[PDB]
A paper describes a structure:
Finally, we obtained a 3.7 Å resolution density map of the [name] head that allowed us to build the full atomic models of the MCPs and CPs in the asymmetric unit of the icosahedron. Therefore, the asymmetric unit of the icosahedron contains 9 monomers of [name], which include one E-hexon, one-third C-hexon, and one-fifth penton and the 9 monomers of [name]. According to the gp5 domain nomenclature in HK97, each [name] monomer can be divided into four domains: an especially extended N-arm domain (residues 2–47), a long β-hairpin E-loop domain (residues 48–91), a P-domain (residues 92–140 and 307–342) containing two α-helices and a three-stranded β-sheet, and a highly complex A-domain (residues 141–307 and 343–367) including the long C-arm (residues 348–367). The superposition of the nine monomers (named A-I) of [name] in the asymmetric unit of the head shows significant conformational changes in the N-arms and E-loops resulting in large-scale swinging. The helix α5 (residues 245–255) of monomer A (from penton) adopts a drastically different conformation to the other eight monomers, which results in a greater curvature in the central conformations of the pentons than in the hexons. Accompanying the movements of the α5 helices, the five bulky sidechains (Trp245) in the penton point to the central pore and form a hydrophobic core. In contrast, the sidechain Trp245 in the hexon flips to the opposite direction and inserts into a hydrophobic pocket formed by Leu237, Leu246, Pro261, Ile262, and Leu267 in the same MCP monomer. The structure of the nine CP monomers (named J-R) in the asymmetric unit are basically identical, which is also true of the nine CPs of KHP30. Three acid residues (Asp23) in the trimeric CP point to the axial center of the trimer and are located on the lower surface of the trimer, separated by a distance of approximately 3Å. In addition, along each quasi-three-fold axis, a three-layered sandwich interface structure is formed by complex electrostatic interactions to maintain the stability of the quasi-three-fold axis.
Residue numbers in the entry:
A (entry chain I): 2 to 53
B (entry chain P), F (entry chain Q), G (entry chain O): 2 to 156
C (entry chain H): 54 to 369
D (entry chain I): 212 to 369
E (entry chain I): 107 to 159
H (entry chain F): 318 to 369
Write the structure that this text describes.
């Protein structure tokens, strides 16, 4: 015959890759543009309880 | 049909005990927005990896309304991955053999001899109810919820 | 040394946060990982610049021509293998080298796209519902863009497809069978002609109608190439042509070359029959798979429109 | 109370938010007038119109955007089956947030080792509250445009 | 469980919490500005949700 | 006879809660060799020093295969230290008095009011089982297991 | 018309011996799209340059079924080029005069004396199955498989 | 050995814990042991007075 290491034989070495595939984060809409401390902002932030 | 329910998925979380022998319980509940059939697999909750049930309490509302009810619920470990939705997964009768709880609303605790002899496993097995007898005439949006106490670090 | 490569996907978190002052030391996440395997194999072919007499009744030396033909053959073979895996099936494409009964390379089999990544032209729900109105149109690639955006908002288990640095920046590439491009640029129901006639009203002779192929539509750089799989069994009663446009984005497929520094064509030379029929044989060691994390593929949306031969004089 | 334009884009324009199902409904229908006006604009400026190079332009003086996480309802309709969405139309103090920790949002990272060094745990959280401003019983700065947005790809499992 | 893998799980855990809270805060904003939690998946918070404070 | 389990010899381990109130449970089990007999004392396990039972669950196999079975297990606290091998050590009838389990497989829980009223002591008291009545006829490899829930910081 | 298999068109290569009188075989097969009919010439496979057949094994899968089958195969060597789509090429009854196989599923072997008397020609030639008589009912998808043994150095 | 010290109950009970990371198996190629022959002789303790 002739040697065949074949598929799935415990001799068949497998190499694991170190690089990670990441399901990247959904891009946020309400970024620093909209949120503001002034009156002219879609999302106002109230600093009346941040230190009190 | 395999009915996924919150806890089996990643939605709601089941807590690990931490420490050894620390009895840990979470309430695995389902709102069955459908009528149970003759053969179903209801993946209630996730028995966390490397933990054994110590006490199991089955809390169930009335599932059958017709006369001479015959619903039987079998609570047991169903082997496979944590939450892979396939009809191939099949449970057994470990925490409960054949429960009378289906006839009318009530609570029956674990009374099988083999309920407390569940062995460990390094992965997150899941607990599944199989309705092993005919629903008969009845059923609606109801709740089945077992409260099993599992401890880690057992020997 | 090793005939397989494994790479990992780290999915996001899906657990409900614990509001209030409720203690959370117990309820904790379990990071979930996904894996896929690329199996290598060897592919070789042999050209035979044969005969001692057959090399004398011809003015041209045959060994050099055989070598060049082998080079070109491996070129087109690797290209069509790429389009065959990125499309997931083999149809009736006749110029393809591989036979019509093709199933795998190294036991990394063909994987038909799921319901989530399979987009039909016009109005359709299955491969057995195509008709003459399900031709590829501007509406269809816009539906492809909408799918590429809200694929997660419909299936909570897949992964976001994200653009590739083509032309300028961050545009989905959409390869197209050269019958679908004809269906677009030679039909008014396809919807491409009207907008490009407006563009021509803006730019005189540089419009894609006159001086080239298709242009971008909603940041979707459209290209056309011969080697796009073309089926022939679609339709309500079969015998209706089809195609598979590829909507590519980042890690669509993985290639694991089995030799150092990329694929290396090593030519082997052997002679038969006491010095007659000199033969040249070479072959690369590689394997290709379409990235399939979980059971939902990761990079391509297979638009599956209906595209007929424009000129019926072709031999079937 | 009348709305006021917000200066987050350009100068004093209402910002409108869409679920990309509604974006597709505008971009691929002749009945949603956007196609005609943008074909004319493309005739004025080709290969730079929003038809070829991205999302929607301004319709009126309202910058149009699209984002995936826009609420979509599946019970609207006579038979309670027609899918629908709720596009926002924001301006000035649409909603307010009380961050209550320090200047800006500050996640509080904490690390705890569960068992003798086994199983490291990383836990974090913010302490903040949100509410859409409601004076009297009426909204102040948001107009909930509520249309019909069907899945353009019926193959999705949903 | 972290020696059976070459990918360190602590750093990935930190990154996943970062993106998860990013996504959660945006989702919460869109939930409150629209006035209802729809039948929209891809949301960390469940289908039946009514405020959080 | 003083057939002692692994827990009594210290071969296995008994858990102690870190904080006061944490219900802790360990499965005290022995795969006893020979046969149960009248008057033998099985030292299943040891509850730690500062600890009182909170719920006792006793599950056994069929410890007698005969006609008119009459085995009656009694479990309680023992007197001497954990490891000392002295037949002059007696149990009580605190957790279970005439438990009458063992004729069938069964699972029994604490029923007597004295089960929950146990008083604490600083040293490691040992929980032992005494077969009160006769073993009827025949039992070879059947196992006896008792599960205790105990808290450490009671008052 | 000519129905070409993969071997004739050049898609699937054909083997040639590298030694004198070394028996070489290849499974010349075709999958029949639509149904066979009278006068159909199926160009199965290409016989290599100087080789001559030494044994041919023909196996088919119940082409016509039906009843009172009347199908009869007829294979031979065509005069035309390797793979030209000329409908004027003819098939002679060299190997199998009247196979009468395909009436029922089975395997037949070369029996006519003319099978082993084929003369060599310096150019490639294509072995072609000709359906002499039309088939009753018929079937679509049934495959024609010819196994050809040839030696490349005969005198 | 990775010594680890942890205190329980407000520092009442200092504890020491350590442990190695190792696994042991006898070389078993095919189904036959590679290098061990186990001899099952009769080992009766000589003294009777020894408890059990």
């Amino acid at each position: 015959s002739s040697t065949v290491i074949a598929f799935g034989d415990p001799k068949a070495q497998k190499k694991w890759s170190s690089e990670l595939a990441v399901d990247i984060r959904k891009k946020s809409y309400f970024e620093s543009r909209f949120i503001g401390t002034s009156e002219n902002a879609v999302i106002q932030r109230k600093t009346e309880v941040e230190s009190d | 049909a395999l009915i996924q329910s919150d806890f089996a998925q990643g939605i709601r979380m089941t807590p690990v005990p931490d420490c050894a022998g620390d009895v840990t319980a979470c309430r695995f509940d389902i709102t069955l927005k459908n009528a149970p059939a003759a053969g179903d697999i209801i993946e209630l909750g996730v028995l966390p990896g490397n933990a054994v049930p110590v006490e199991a309490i089955l809390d169930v509302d009335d599932l059958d309304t017709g006369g001479a009810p015959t619903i039987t619920l079998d609570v047991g470990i169903m082997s496979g991955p944590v939450g892979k939705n396939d009809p191939a997964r099949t449970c057994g009768n470990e925490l409960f053999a054949a429960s009378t709880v289906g006839q009318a609303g009530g609570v029956v605790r674990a009374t099988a001899s083999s309920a407390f002899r569940i062995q460990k496993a390094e992965d997150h097995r899941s607990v599944g109810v199989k309705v092993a007898a005919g629903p008969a005439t009845g059923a609606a949006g109801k709740t089945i919820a077992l409260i099993l106490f599992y401890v880690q670090g057992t020997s | 040394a090793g005939d397989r490569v494994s790479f990992d996907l780290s999915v996001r978190l899906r657990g409900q946060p614990t509001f209030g002052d409720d203690r959370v030391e117990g309820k904790e996440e379990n990071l979930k990982f996904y894996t896929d395997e690329v199996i290598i194999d060897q592919v070789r072919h042999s050209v035979s610049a044969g005969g001692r007499m057959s090399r004398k009744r011809t003015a041209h030396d045959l060994r050099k021509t055989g070598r060049d033909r082998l080079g070109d053959y491996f070129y087109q073979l690797t290209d069509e293998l790429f389009f065959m895996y990125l499309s997931g099936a083999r149809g009736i494409n006749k110029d393809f080298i591989l036979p019509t009964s093709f199933t795998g390379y190294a036991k990394n089999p063909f994987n038909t796209p799921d319901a989530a990544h399979l987009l039909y032209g016009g109005v359709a729900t299955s491969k057995a519902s195509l008709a003459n109105t399900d031709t590829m149109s501007r509406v269809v690639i816009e539906r492809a863009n909408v799918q590429a955006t809200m694929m997660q908002a419909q299936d909570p288990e897949t992964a976001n497809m994200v653009p590739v640095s083509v032309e300028g920046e961050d545009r989905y590439v959409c390869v197209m069978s050269p019958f679908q491009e004809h269906s677009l640029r030679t039909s008014d129901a396809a919807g491409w002609l009207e907008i490009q006639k407006a563009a021509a009203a803006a730019e005189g002779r540089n419009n894609p109608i006159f001086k080239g192929g298709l242009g971008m539509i909603g940041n979707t750089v459209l290209h056309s190439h011969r080697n796009v799989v073309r089926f022939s069994d679609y339709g309500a009663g079969s015998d209706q042509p089809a195609a598979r446009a590829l909507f590519m984005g980042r890690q669509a497929a993985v290639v694991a070359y089995g030799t150092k520094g990329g694929l290396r064509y090593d030519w082997q030379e052997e002679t038969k029959d006491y010095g007659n029929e000199p033969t040249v044989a070479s072959g690369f060691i590689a394997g290709i798979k379409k990235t399939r994390f979980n059971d939902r593929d990761f990079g391509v949306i297979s638009i599956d429109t209906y595209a007929k031969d424009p000129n019926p004089n072709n031999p079937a």
